[PDB]
């Protein structure tokens, strides 16, 4: 058995527990779930106008998942340098998950146009490749929200759990079973603008950052051990 | 009617608690228990383990609802000859909790230690090729077989998958990955260390009981394709 | 009714907090259909597991120690550090490592404290007889990593074990330090920021005397589990990354790129000036006095040749038909862009073509030539 204990040979007196930092710093940390709701960068993109897009056109689409994206490293100096952050490092330790996610997408300053954002639980995830942000229409019955840039250029979201599942896969997904692609992402969030073709040209090569966190609904399943790790100071200068 | 014994006390490592029957949410067909016939034990993999197998080496990546059938269709007969598995031939959709014993019959003078580990949905990950090692599967709960005392590894494995039913044949929403729950993988930790005049062989037998199964969706047995080799 | 009472007097801010993850009501824009809706867990879908001490109470296999017959009565078996950060190296230009679960969940925090129960599982028959110290010295630096043996070990805290009919024991490594916590050994990618508080040692006190029917060598497995008093406090940048994507990109400078927010570019026209992203910037090539520079990469044609200050505060890269028109002798030789010599060397506007853009930020090659 793993967690057995054959013969304790303790030398120690009993340590005063700090209560996981509650005694010093005034706050507990034993519950890792309350750390998980600290926001982490999800994926940063650069806008790129390909066609003279219609107002209906989504500017970028991305699947929505707590696993962390297919990591897209002119490299992005964070994903070149600060590997993975926190939440996929914890999410490596659990085979499944079930629960909500929060997003809080942040938009640049020079944009002014109105922003529509969709949740699409119809969309599956086909393989770990093309499970990243994709620079590409607006739809009716999908769950929608418009943030106005002129009031505040940061939308926030509580994207719920819409799967017909007991829970969903949390490690990186190779798409073995064909219906299992329905059971990895929560769905697919799409961000599109109402900008016309003349004004969207100024917004080219502006960064659009997306954050994420779980938001109290997430409950991880069966334990799985960690994968092999890379030590970050060993990365070259 | 299959009764099996061991001389030594087991070392179970239950991964998850016992699950519900789950027949109320998605089956209106005759959901029939078969505890008189399917709860028999059945040998699915025996293999020779000698000292030439190195430290971090696989022995058998048994996929357990498949390997109950794969040992049958490997062993020169169809499903209708084994009374454990004829409800897989008739019915189309399966659920159920498994019991898995990994018996060893090592001599006492041998020194070695296998491990048995259940993992959920091995084939639904690509990164298990980085993980398929003793250090990864030690962190999750796992049974241990010491070849010194010839310990046995009983191993309760409750059914836990994303969808609450595993199909048994080609099904209109998935085909690949049929009746797959994950990997029972038997990784060596301590290899056989013996004298020059030592007993080299060490056979390992794996039995499986299938008790809280439910079968639903009765259909014709001519639809049931063979499992993959 | 007229509401003439004087109103509130606030402060706007643009974003809710990020590090706050606790008893704090967070307002959002839910894409759920229901306002009182919460994701739920039915009778089988209530998940089993999440807690730092739920991770820190799992053994992880961390060291294979060979233990032979002819190891002497003072031979070292491991000098490994008494932190949760236990070094286990797997044999890429970056290397990957196993860790204990308490090691990783320590590596997602700044500080740790408490005991560390290392389990020694000594795989042998009951015919082997052994004896070995598991000692523990608090506070040995790197220069004191030498001078170590069992005789100087037994001054400190130590546990002598007899390998017999029982073969396994979990020693509980104490937490002995001056500080209430202890800083993470590795930190971010940052060469300053500290070794272990204390060191474990394991010497063979009495060597293995096996029987002649069994083997001379014996495996010793060393597991690591966080102790019962283990606890971590401050959430910082993690020191460990996954191996889903082991790709790494260096940033030596002898390589070129377009400036940030100016790639991808395309060949086109500009009324102040072929030359765009609004003209795309380019880095200033570090040319000393008496040289010239031209570019060849690693419209109507692919533009494999291309730097001079535009006059509007940023550099421009002019496309040429070949490296001959590009080969900078005029401009570094004292000319200017308005020269007729320069205007003949330029590409005319008709070569704009359909104008397919470059793929991202294509790394050019900086050719430096004497003048």
Numbering used by the authors:
A (entry chain A): 2 to 74, 79 to 141, 150 to 250
B (entry chain B): 21 to 44, 46 to 250
C (entry chain C): 3 to 51, 53 to 94, 97 to 198, 200 to 279, 285 to 286, 288 to 289, 295 to 315, 323 to 330, ...
What text comes from the article?
The genome release of iflaviruses can be induced in vitro by exposing the particles to acidic pH. We show that acidic pH induces expansion of the RNA genome in the DWV particle, which, in turn, triggers the swelling and flower-like opening of its capsid. Native virions of DWV at neutral pH are uniform in size with a radius (the distance of the center of the mass of a pentamer from the center of the capsid) of 135 Å. The changes in the organization of the RNA genomes of DWV in acidic pH are connected to the radial expansion of the particles by 15 to 33% relative to the native virions at neutral pH. Pentamers of capsid protein protomers maintain a similar structure to that of the native virion, but the distances between the centers of masses of adjacent pentamers increase from 141 Å in the native virions to 164 to 192 Å in the expanded particles. In silico simulations of the expansion of DWV capsid have shown that residues 1 to 61 from the N termini of VP2 subunits can change their conformations and mediate attractive interpentamer interactions up to a distance of 7 nm. Therefore, the N termini of VP2 subunits enable the flexible expansion of DWV capsids and the deviation of its overall structure from icosahedral symmetry. The capsids of genome-containing particles being larger than those of empty particles provide evidence that at acidic pH, the genome exerts pressure on the inside of the capsid. After 30 min of incubation in phosphate-buffered saline (PBS) with pH 5.5 at 34°C, the capsids of 80% of DWV particles were open in a manner reminiscent of the opening of petals of a flower. The opening or removal of a single pentamer from the expanded DWV capsid results in the formation of a pore with a diameter of 190 Å, which is sufficient for the release of the RNA genome without major unwinding of its putative secondary and tertiary structure.
